Structures are given as C-alpha cells and as structure tokens.
Design an enzyme around this catalytic site. Structure first.
Site, PDB file in Angstrom:
ATOM      1  N   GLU A 233      15.518  -8.023  66.801  1.00 45.04           N
ATOM      2  CA  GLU A 233      15.965  -6.638  66.655  1.00 45.04           C
ATOM      3  C   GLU A 233      15.870  -5.798  67.932  1.00 45.04           C
ATOM      4  OE1 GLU A 233      13.258  -6.371  63.258  1.00 45.04           O
ATOM      5  OE2 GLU A 233      14.906  -5.253  62.274  1.00 45.04           O
TER       6      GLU A 233
ATOM      7  N   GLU B  49      18.156  -9.506  52.842  1.00 45.59           N
ATOM      8  CA  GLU B  49      16.698  -9.367  52.647  1.00 45.59           C
ATOM      9  C   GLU B  49      16.374  -8.949  51.199  1.00 45.59           C
ATOM     10  OE1 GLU B  49      14.507  -6.949  55.498  1.00 45.59           O
ATOM     11  OE2 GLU B  49      12.719  -6.984  54.241  1.00 45.59           O
TER      12      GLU B  49
ATOM     13  N   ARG C 115      10.049   3.622  60.111  1.00 50.23           N
ATOM     14  CA  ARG C 115      10.288   2.960  61.392  1.00 50.23           C
ATOM     15  C   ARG C 115      11.065   3.895  62.350  1.00 50.23           C
ATOM     16  NH1 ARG C 115       9.813  -1.721  64.139  1.00 50.23           N
ATOM     17  NH2 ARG C 115       8.632  -2.671  62.427  1.00 50.23           N
TER      18      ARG C 115
END
Ligand SMILES: Cc1cc2nc3c(=O)[nH]c(=O)nc-3n(C[C@H](O)[C@H](O)[C@H](O)COP(=O)(O)OP(=O)(O)OC[C@H]3O[C@@H](n4cnc5c(N)ncnc54)[C@H](O)[C@@H]3O)c2cc1C
Ligand code: FES
Ligand code: FES
Length: 1290
Positions: A1235, A776, A854
C-alpha cells in the site's frame, strides 16, 4: 446447411446445434474446457478474452491473422476459420517466446490479464515478426492490467523489436523466436477455400442466424423480413444483447458478401464496403496517406486521427465501418468526420439504389438514420481533399455515460482558390446532443470572410450560443463540453493558418507566434526509458538462499500459458447449478411485491431465494448490520433482494430479468452533505488532537482555509468476485472455492447464515485475479448467497459476477470531503492545523470506521505539526457499502495534507520542495498520535530522489518550457510519504502456517495468506527455503484453506508477508529442531537421509507455526500506545505536460525511491511499487464514478470507467529500492510494500496543479480549486481563458 465447422488450436470442431447467442469465449471455456481465455468485462474494453483468428481471405487470396475479443465473437460468425488460444502457442513444458518473456520479465502478477496480453503480442508477431517499439505498445490498446503498471510487460517484449545494481531479468537467456515453428494453417481450410460458400442457417433457443453468401440472399431476406437485424462484427449488437437485454429473434450476418468488403478507388475518393473492418480502413488509408500528396489526404488523416485512440486491435479487426455509421451513437467518432467531409453513402434494397451525401438530415433522431427498414448501407466513399481544402478531427478522451456527452468533432474548410476567403465551412459534433450535429447556424455566417481573428471570434461566439446545453443536460460536464467545442475550433483555426502559410498565397494570412505552435501538434510519444535500481545480496550468500533475490513469481509461467486455475476455471460437476443475484433498482424503498411468474417460464429455472429461505440468520457483515437478502426494505441501488438458481448462467440471467419487484420509495440519503444535515453517521466523531490550536492560530503569520473533495475508486480486479459451493450432504458439511482475501469471515458468515458450526465449513483459495481490498469483506455477499443455493438444492452451485454486477454491488474506496484551516509562518513553518474529514460509507458499516482511523493517523503525512486537531465522521447513506481499497484511508488523509501544504508554499512565495523539507519530521519526533519515529529513512529517500531526479535542473527546464508555450504547460512536484504498518485493530496482527515434510524430502507448506498477484507465496517459499536451508524447488504451496490454518486475518494492510513469514519461519525452526540429532549423526549426508531417518525413528515431520506482532495498541481516549509496528517511507518526483485547451496531459517522468527494508524479493517489490503507484495515478487523475441523483451507479464497466492503460504510465519511469536500511522487527529485516507507494502518485496530481497555475498566470485568484480526481474536465475548467469565460458568460 446447418453444421458449424471451425478449428481450435489446429483441431477441427463440428458443432451440429450452434446457438447464435453462444459467444466464442463461452464455447472455449464451457464446451471445449479451454479456460486460458478469460472473462474480464464482456464489453470489449479489457482484452482478457483476446484470441487469434486465422482465415483464408478470398478477396486478397492470402492467409490473414488478427486478434479478437472472444467475449463478443458469435461462434455463428466463425464458420471455416481457425482459432488460436493461449493453449495453442505453448505450455509450461514448452513455452512460446511471448509466454517465456512476459513471465521472466515480471510482467505477470495476478496473472488474469496475462493470456490476453500474450495473445495480443503473439498476434502482432504473426503479422510483423520484427515490430517497432511503437507497434508493440499499440498492440495493447485493448488490454488492461490492474497489477503491473505495464512497465515490465513492455520492457520484456521490447526484446522482440528491431529498434530496441543487478538486473531484474536477463534477456540473453530468452529462447529466440523462429517464426517457421508456428502452427500450420489447417490444410482442410485451404481445400475448402475452393468450394463456393452457400447460405447457412443456425437456430438457437430464441434466435435464428442466417449467414448470407450473396447480396441477393441478403436483400431478399430484408425485403421479406425488414426486422432481420444485420450483425457484422457484433461490437454493438453484442452489448445490446448482453447488457441492454435486447433480443433480435432473426439475425443476418452479411460478412461474407464480397460487395460489402470491397475497396474501390474513384475520382472523388475511396469507396469502402459497409462491412470493411476499421483495421482495413486504417491500413488502406495509411498506404494512401504515405503515397499521395498532402493536399489530397486531409480527410483521410482526420479519419486516421479518430481511429488512433479508438478501442484496440481486437475491436478494429471486426468492428465494421458501416456498423459504426448505422449504430448512430451520439458519440461516434467517425460520424462527425463523415458528416463534415460530406461522405457519400450508397443505400440499397431489393430493387432500389440511392446515394446521399451525409449531412444533418442523415440522423433525424436518437440512434436513427434515414435508411428504410429494408435498405442496407452498401458503401461509403471517403473523399480526397481538394486544393485549398483543410480538415481536422478532435475528441474528448474522457467518458462518463454509455453513449452521450463526449465531444468529438470533424471540421472542414474550403477556400475560394488563391484566397483565404471561405467558400465552404463545416463544423460537426458528437456529444453535444442525442445525435451527430452540424453547427448550421454558425457556419453560413462565415462564408466569404477572410480566415482571420474576426472569423475566430465570430465562430466562437456562434458556437457558444448555438451549442447550448441545459444545466441538467444529459451526461453533465456542461461547461467542459462547451469549452471543448470552442477549444477544438481554436486548434482548427490555428492549424488552418499554419497550412495556409505553407501554400505561398498572394494575400499573406497571419503567422503563428512560436508560443502557439505547440497548440496544433498531434499527440507524439517519445522513446520510453525505465530504470530499476535495487541492492545485490551479500557475495557470500548461498546460491540456494533466494531471500533478497529477484525470483520470478512462482506461478508466472503457468499464468502466461493459461494453465493457472482461477475459481471459474475449475470444471463444473455434471449436477452443478448457476446463481444470479437480483438487486434493488431503488436507493431507499419498501418492497411491496415480488412476482416470479415470468422467472418460472425460463427453461432450467430451479428457484428464487429470498430472506425467508435463510435457515438461521439474515444478519451478516462485519458489524452485523447487513442483510444476506433484503427484508421489506432496500437501502441502496444494488441491495441484494434474492437469487435466481438455474442450470446455466444464461438461464439464470433471463430468469433474473423475470423477477418483478414493486417498490414504495422512502426518503434517501445519498451524498455526504445529505448525511451531514440528516445526522446520518456510523457512530460518533473520531478525533486526534495535540497542542494548543487557539495559541497556534493566534501566533501564525497567515491562516488559510478551504475544502477538498476526493472521489472514490472501483478496484477493477480483473477477476470479478466468484464462488463455487459444494455441499457434501453429510452433517451440514460444505466446501467453498472462493476468490477472497478473507477465508475466515467467508467461513464464519456462511456458517452463521446456515446455522451450523464453523467446523463444517471449509473455504479454499488457490489464487485471486486481483483483490486490492475489495475482496477483504465484500466477496461474502456472493459466497453467502451461493452457499444457501447449494444447501437448499444439495447440488454444487457457482456464481461469477459480470463486471456491471460487481462494480454495482461490491462498493469501492470511500469518497472524502475535508474542511481544513492551516496556520503558518512566513518561512512556511506550519504552527496550527484543524481538519474535519467526512467519508461516504454507504449502506453498511463494514470497514468504514477503521478506514477513517487510518486517514486521521496520516493527516500529518510527513510533517511535524505542534498544534493539530483532526476529526472524522463516517456518513451513512443509501449507496453500496464502501470498503477496503489499497491504502485504506491513508491516501485520502495524505492528499488533504499535501493539498493545504501546496497552498502553504504558494501563500509564502517559497519553493514547495523547501517548504515540505523544513516541515518534515526528524528522527525521534513523535507523531500527532504520540508514536516515536525510529529508523526514519524518509530524509535519505528525499535526498536520493532529489539527486537522482535532478529536480532542481528539471524545475528550470519546466519554467523555460512554460515561457516558450502558451497553450501547453509543464509541472514538476516531489512528494514524500510515511505509511503506518499493522492493522489498526491490534489482534488482527497474527498469522499461522502449517508445514509437512514427506518421506521423499519434499515439503508442502501452507499459511493464512492468500495469493492475489502480490507474490506472497513466492516470498513465503523464499523464506521457508532460507529457514530450512534447502532449495526453493523442494517446497510447494498449493493453496490457502481454513482446514489447514484457522482463524486467519484477511490478506490486507500490506502485512501478510510480515505475519505469515514469521509463522512460516517458526514452523520451519520446529522441523529443524527435530532434525538436529540426525544432522549431528550425518552432518554431510543429504536432506533426504535426515528426513527418512527422522521418519523411521518415529519423529513428527509436521508442525504449526504462529506469530503475533508484539506491543501494539492505541487509545483515542489517552492519545497513547503504538498503532503501528513500523513505518514505510518513500518519495516520488513526477513531471507532466498538460494541454490547456483539452485538459489532456502526458506523464513525462516519475522517479521513486522506496524504503522496503532489505527486500525479500526486489523484482516483486519493484512490481508492487509500480502497480501501487499506477493504481494511485488512476485514483488521482482518471477513475471517476458517476451516480444519478437518485443514487444509481452509471459507471459499470471500462467503456465509462477509465483505469490506466499501457499508454497512461510515465514515459520515463524510474524506481529505486533504498540500500542499507534493514528493518530488524520484520521478517529477515524486510518491510511491507503493498500500500505505501500508492499515495506517491499524488506527485502527478500536484505536478498537474503546478501546470494549471502556470496556465492561469498566462491568462493572466491564486488558491484555485482542484478536486480529486484531476480529470480532463477539472484540468480544462481550471485553465481559465477567453474560451472558458465566453462559455460561462458572453
Ligand atoms: C470496446 C469498444 C470500444 C469502442 N470505441 C469506440 C470509439 O472510441 N469511437 C467510436 O466511434 N465507436 C467505438 N466503438 C463502437 C464501434 O466502432 C462499433 O461498435 C462498430 O463500428 C460497429 O461495427 P460492427 O460491425 O461491430 O456492428 P454490429 O454490432 O454488428 O452492428 C451495429 C449496427 O449496425 C447495423 N449494421 C451493420 N452493418 C450494416 C449495413 N451494412 N447496413 C445497415 N445496417 C448495418 C446493425 O444492424 C447494427 O444495428 C467501440 C466499441 C467497443 C466494443
Ligand atoms: S472480457 Fe472480452 S474484452 Fe473484457
Ligand atoms: S497481472 Fe495483469 S490484471 Fe493482474
């Protein structure tokens, strides 16, 4: 004399200038252009390079077939063999059964491991056209897959075995196998078998290779040149040359010599020639074990047991027995067995022959034997066991350093005949010193003694004293290894008692209690039994509308055939150059000097790039706090300092070795605790809190505090990071072919570095062999460097990282430290929770802050908590920068949640399933961050999983097992999850598509998403085909490119099908709107006529499409606004059996119910649940990274980093997709899937925790510590007993 002659896929290859350093993998790929065979590790662990060898065995007078790792096979060892690669067995025009079956069974996701697995299976069928299920599983011990979770590969291939909701595939449609239609053994090699083989000489740039034809040649060469390095299978030397930069200028390969390949039966045992492959040893001893009486085969069976979990078929076909012995690794599994059995070695030179029975003396020092430099090992005699002679072998299956500190043991006892009195006793150990040792202080004490409890305790006391390790002993795990030596002896002690009992003695020996019996059983896999449940699409849905149907990944056939192109498979331009990075060997230091004087002497050397070569800016990275190249200071072991450019990868690698850096060390901050007490953080504390903590705790019945450490994770995408940069020579224009999830940032970082506008830079991604978040952002450290080499030279430049490079440089999941305090009632209702999280971010910010966000957004997991405070702090440290990994802080946040929850249940004395259930959110509840939970499917996931897993009945059987078994225990746990879907940075929730309809009616589609094995392109074609109402066959996606769709988000946060699906959908609606008039005028006439009518009417047949997720935006300041568009929900029940004496365990069964809305593609979504779960299984139970005290990563390949293998997965593995749960607010009512399932593997972790508790209650404090990952070390050490107590203190 001099020519190398072999066959590849039936075609003769004549190589007139064979370099001994050239591997078969390099030859196939760079010389023959056959790029089906892949580089995954170059170490023999991964199998991505697996090919088949066929030859005429002179010694057996037959054609043999075996698999090998091409990455380790010198071409110079392959004279007069025939190689078969994936391209040799079939293609997309005519697929081999092996190819067709792995593709159609959804056994190929990213596709990078597919050729290797295909060749392992293919080779099995050439040896055994009707194998058992067991043989099929064993065929893949040397093959790793990071994506599939293995289940679909075994299930698809199960169709070849003699002993074998809609379906995901149809086995009845598979073409049958006709073994007669395989390719002929090259008749030329049958003609040449008759010619006598003579000595061959090959001369390379640095190395001379002599292929010796007779014992006389070999011994002559060693007498005149004792420096001559013997190479047989090259499975150790290959590693020494590739990874330890050792150079043996003169090599001799004696593999042809008959005397080194012979098998001779004698009165005392079976003599094997030193160059006999372990596969031959295995096949010979197995026939002997089956034929001979048990009393004769005790040592044979010990050898076979060590070879069971010993590399794969690829290594054992060429790894020689003699090679294992003379390597003399401290962690050889065979040397302890040979030592304990006193195996007889025959050593020869020109004019000498001697015999030694292996004992402590044979290995006098680290990697030394007592051979003289001119001697070679001729043969080893593996002895028959005598009457009253017993043998056991044991080994730690959990490796932390290259060649030390893994316990492995041979143990032998000889009894005075008719008695239980000890005549002889030999206990030998690897992994307890810098060499194989014998416990020679402990065993002499035991001679004469009877085999009883007094002997057990004397040996254990003796071993605990004699096998001492300093607390800083090399390889760590000091208590575990010590405990293993006693525990292994205990197993042997008990095993000998059993055998004694079977013999009908005069003196009665001592019987095992039934609860101890399971302690001596050898590992046994029961029959696998897998279930995949999903929802049929409505009966009235068109056969052409594939949305919701299990369409195979569009590239699966090409992936199985090796025709799919990954970056490094792209052919080289003739002027193309190779780059190699040069990295810091220091955690924190000044660079004082760089000397390139040795680099420059390497043939083909072009230049060394450093900071000063950067045209524009040396500031890069997501938050602009990273160097392209180190300037004056290095800040981690792995910090890129510069880059060698040369003509070839090998020349780049040698030149990189000749760049000498001098350093002046600076204070380093390594661990989380280092960073805390140095106030070394990325920005400020992040915090969420709601309710009244003070009141909450003061009103609770109980309070429980504690701490938890969670280790990180390497992505281990099977394709490493790779970039080709092609400079166009005009206006700064450059084109890059990159294995990256993030074309936008690649482009933007390259442009900034060079100082040109974005519009000059094109980044193209066909596909990745895996990503998982590690591409990423961290892919750009390679891209940028290579872009610079391309700019400076004006030539194309390529860099593919080796595995050790990639693991060292590109970082991994964030380690987390948590400190928690939970307040709860006697009912188990949680009333108060405070958690402080710390993450180890490493030496740049990257995504670390978003990841901590998160974790905090999921510190609740599934549970409503009225009074709650979470803080997070990201530590800044002198380590490689940690990044995105599938879950992106979620699994860390959630594991902490489930960890204190486990302690809530235990503290209350109440069933864990009830305590979780009563704390669970209900529909309409607000989270701790004040988002409302609508379409709250979790309860149904739970109820379904409880019923389908038969959890309550299985809990009873577990409890029963535990009462009946003292030294094995089972555990059972059911775990739920909530996972928020959307990037935490709101503007990233956008995507674009572009569609063309050509005048033949064919459609070319592209969108910002990248394919990395998740089947995104497949889904987008399914979407486009429904939207346009034409078959999938009329629509094609070639690739992802910044010059077709700009400003794309990374392919991440599980959101890519959501974002791009909408984009694709909109672009298709635009096209439809334009075709509407032509549809009206010919409502029957077909697609093609509408399109041609639009064209000849001058209507645009090209459209953009775009989507932005509406209404997102959370404030940490007001604790308001929705960070997520929706939530994914799921539940997994897992059962394990632990071995309390070794810390090993089996995953017996896992049941998963996952809400993925109305799946776009249930085959692919089941694929993703299984892959995600298996990566989580890795995170939580295997997969430990180790670092030196000075911050150097030691675990840099599959030898020391253990990702799940075929044999690791739950033996019964059941997955259900939840029925009738449409999700209105994403594409065609789907949900993201990538995920959310990962964290459900924590169910294996907490099942292990339940098993450990049961073991602890057997002998005989309640909230014991289990950090993540729960490795064999952590499981064993927590299973407190008489052995752990003795080892920790007499
Ligand atoms: C992926 C992988 C997994 C592995 N797992 C294990 C494991 O679990 N347990 C374990 O114990 N080992 C393991 N090994 C090591 C393996 O068993 C050895 O590498 C192998 O047996 C060496 O045999 P070779 O013919 O390949 O030796 P080479 O690499 O060709 O040579 C090894 C050494 O032996 C010398 N030598 C070879 N033959 C002779 C002879 N006749 N006389 C004198 N010197 C000789 C060579 O000069 C060299 O120094 C593993 C290796 C790999 C690659
Ligand atoms: S590349 Fe050969 S085993 Fe991994
Ligand atoms: S499909 Fe096996 S590694 Fe990706």
């Amino acid at each position: 004399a001099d020519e190398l002659v072999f066959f590849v896929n039936g075609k003769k290859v004549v190589e007139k200038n064979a370099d001994p350093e050239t591997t078969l993998l390099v030859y196939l790929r760079r010389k023959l252009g056959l790029c089906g065979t892949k580089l995954g590790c170059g170490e023999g662990g991964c199998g991505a390079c697996t090919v088949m060898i066929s030859k005429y065995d002179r010694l057996q007078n037959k054609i043999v077939h075996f698999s090998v790792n091409a990455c380790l096979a010198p071409i110079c060892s392959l004279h007069h063999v025939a190689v078969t690669t994936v391209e040799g067995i079939g293609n997309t025009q005519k697929l081999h059964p092996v190819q067709e079956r792995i593709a159609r069974s959804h056994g190929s996701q990213c596709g990078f491991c597919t050729p290797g697995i295909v060749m392992s299976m293919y080779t099995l069928l050439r040896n055994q056209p009707e194998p058992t299920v067991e043989e099929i599983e064993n065929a893949f011990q040397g093959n790793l897959c990071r994506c599939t979770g293995y289940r679909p590969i075994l299930q698809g291939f199960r169709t070849f075995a003699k002993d074998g909701s809609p379906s995901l595939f149809n086995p009845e449609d598979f073409k049958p196998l006709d073994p007669t239609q395989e390719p002929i053994f090259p008749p030329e090699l049958l003609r040449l078998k008759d010619t006598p083989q003579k000595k061959l000489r090959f001369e390379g740039e640095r190395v001379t290779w002599i292929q010796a034809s007779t014992m006389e040649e070999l011994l002559d060469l060693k007498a005149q040149h004792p420096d001559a390095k013997l190479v047989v299978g090259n499975t150790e030397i290959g590693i020494e040359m590739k990874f330890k930069n050792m150079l043996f200028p003169l090599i001799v390969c004696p593999a042809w010599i008959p005397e080194l390949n012979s098998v001779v039966h004698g009165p005392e045992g079976i003599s094997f020639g030193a160059s006999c492959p372990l596969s031959l040893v295995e096949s010979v001893l197995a026939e002997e074990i089956a034929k001979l009486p048990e009393q004769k085969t005790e040592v044979f069976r010990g050898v076979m047991e060590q070879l069971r979990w010993f590399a794969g078929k690829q290594v054992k076909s060429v790894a020689s027995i003699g090679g294992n012995i003379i390597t003399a690794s401290p962690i050889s599994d065979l040397n302890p067995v040979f030592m304990a059995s006193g195996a007889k070695l025959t050593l020869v030179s020109r004019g000498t022959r001697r015999t030694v029975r292996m004992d402590h003396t044979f290995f006098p020092g680290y990697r030394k034997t007592l051979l003289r430099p001119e001697e070679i090992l001729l043969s080893i005699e593996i002895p028959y066991s005598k009457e009253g002679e017993f043998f056991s072998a044991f080994k730690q299956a959990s490796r932390r350093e290259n060649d030390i500190a893994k316990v492995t043991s041979g143990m032998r006892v000889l009894f005075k005949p008719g008695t239980i009195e000890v005549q002889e006793l030999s206990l030998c150990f690897g992994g307890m010193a810098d060499r194989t040792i014998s416990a020679l202080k402990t065993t002499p004490k035991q001679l004469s003694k009877s085999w009883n409890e007094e002997l057990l305790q004397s040996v254990c006391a003796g071993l605990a004293e004699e096998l001492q390790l300093a607390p800083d002993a090399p390889g760590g795990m000091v208590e575990f290894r010590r405990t293993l030596t006693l525990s292994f002896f205990f197993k042997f002690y008990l095993t000998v008692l059993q055998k004694l009992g079977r013999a009908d003695l005069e003196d009665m020996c001592g019987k095992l209690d039934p609860t101890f019996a399971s302690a001596t059983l050898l590992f046994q896999k029961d029959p696998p039994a897998n279930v995949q449940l999903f929802q049929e699409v409505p009966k009235d849905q068109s056969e052409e509308d594939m949305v919701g149907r299990p369409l195979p990944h569009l590239a699966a056939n090409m992936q199985a055939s090796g025709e799919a192109v990954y970056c490094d498979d792209i052919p080289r331009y003739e002027n193309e150059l190779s780059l190699r990075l040069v990295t810091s060997t220091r955690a924190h230091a000044k660079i004082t000097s760089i000397d390139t004087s040795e680099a420059k002497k390497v043939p083909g050397f072009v230049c060394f790039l450093t900071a000063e070569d950067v045209p524009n800016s040396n500031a890069t990275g997501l938050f602009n706090d990273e160097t392209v190249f180190a300037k004056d200071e290095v800040t981690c072991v792995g910090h890129i300092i510069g880059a060698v450019v040369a003509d070839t990868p090998e020349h780049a690698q040698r030149a990189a070795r000749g760049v000498k850096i001098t350093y002046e060390d600076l204070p380093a901050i390594i661990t989380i605790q280092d960073a805390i007490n140095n106030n070394s953080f990325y920005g400020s504390e992040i915090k969420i809190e709601k309710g009244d903590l003070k009141k909450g705790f003061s009103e609770a019945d109980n309070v429980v505090s504690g701490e938890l450490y969670i280790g990180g994770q390497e992505h281990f995408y099977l394709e490493t990071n790779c970039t080709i940069a092609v400079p166009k020579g005009e206006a700064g224009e450059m084109e890059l072919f990159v294995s990256t999830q993030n074309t936008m940032k690649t482009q933007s970082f390259v442009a900034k570095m060079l100082g040109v506008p974005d519009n000059r830079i094109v980044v193209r991604v066909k596909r990745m062999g895996g990503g998982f978040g590690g591409k990423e952002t961290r892919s750009t450290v390679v891209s940028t460097a290579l872009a610079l080499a391309a700019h400076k030279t004006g030539r194309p430049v390529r860099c593919m990282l080796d595995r050790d490079e990639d693991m060292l440089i590109t970082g991994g999941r964030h380690p987390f430290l948590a400190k928690y305090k939970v307040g709860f009632m006697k009912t188990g209702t949680v009333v108060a929770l405070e958690v402080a999280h710390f993450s180890n971010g490493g030496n740049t910010e990257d995504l670390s802050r978003s990841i901590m966000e998160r974790a905090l957004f999921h510190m609740d997991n599934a549970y409503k908590i009225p009074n709650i405070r979470g803080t997070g702090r990201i530590c800044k440290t002198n380590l490689p920068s940690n990044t995105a990994f599938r879950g992106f802080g979620g699994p860390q946040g959630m594991l902490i949640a489930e960890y204190w929850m486990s302690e809530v249940a235990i503290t209350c004395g109440l069933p864990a399933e009830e305590v979780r259930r009563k704390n669970m959110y209900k529909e309409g509840d607000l989270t701790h961050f004040n988002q409302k939970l609508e379409g709250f499917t979790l309860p149904r996931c739970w109820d379904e999983c409880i019923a389908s897993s038969q959890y309550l009945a299985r809990k009873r059987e577990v409890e029963k097992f535990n009462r009946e078994n003292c030294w094995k225990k089972r555990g059972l746990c059911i775990i739920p999850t909530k996972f928020g879907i959307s990037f935490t940075l709101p503007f990233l929730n956008q995507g674009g598509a572009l569609v063309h309809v050509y005048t033949d009616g064919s459609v070319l589609l592209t969108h910002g998403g990248t394919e990395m094995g998740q089947g995104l392109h497949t889904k987008m074609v399914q979407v486009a085909s429904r939207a346009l109402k034409i078959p999938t066959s009329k629509i094609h996606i070639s690739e992802t490119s910044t010059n077709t769709v700009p400003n794309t988000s990374p392919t991440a946060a599980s959101a890519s099908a959501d974002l791009n699906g909408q984009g694709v959908y909109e672009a298709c609606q635009t096209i439809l709107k334009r075709l509407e008039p032509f549809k009206k005028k010919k409502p029957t006439g077909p697609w093609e006529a509408w399109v041609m009518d639009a064209y000849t009417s001058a209507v645009s047949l090209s459209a953009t499409g775009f989507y932005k997720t509406p209404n997102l935006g959370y404030s940490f300041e007001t604790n308001s606004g929705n960070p997520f568009h929706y939530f994914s929900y799921g539940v997994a029940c897992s059962e394990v059996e632990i071995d309390c004496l070794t810390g090993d365990h089996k995953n017996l069964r896992t049941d998963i119910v996952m809400d993925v809305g109305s799946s776009l593609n249930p085959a692919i979504d089941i694929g993703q649940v299984e892959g995600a779960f298996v990566q989580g299984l890795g995170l939580f139970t295997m997969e430990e990274l180790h670092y030196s005290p000075e911050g150097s990563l030691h675990t840099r390949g599959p030898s020391t980093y253990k990702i799940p293998a075929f044999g690791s997965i739950p033996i019964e593995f059941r997955v259900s997709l939840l029925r009738d749960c449409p999700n209105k607010r994403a594409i065609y009512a789907s949900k993201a899937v990538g995920e959310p399932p990962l964290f459900l593997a924590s169910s294996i972790f907490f099942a292990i925790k339940d098993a450990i508790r049961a073991a602890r209650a057997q002998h005989g404090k309640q909230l014991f510590q289990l950090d993540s990952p729960a490795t064999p070390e952590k499981i064993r050490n927590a299973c407190v007993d008489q052995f752990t107590t003795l080892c920790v203190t007499g």
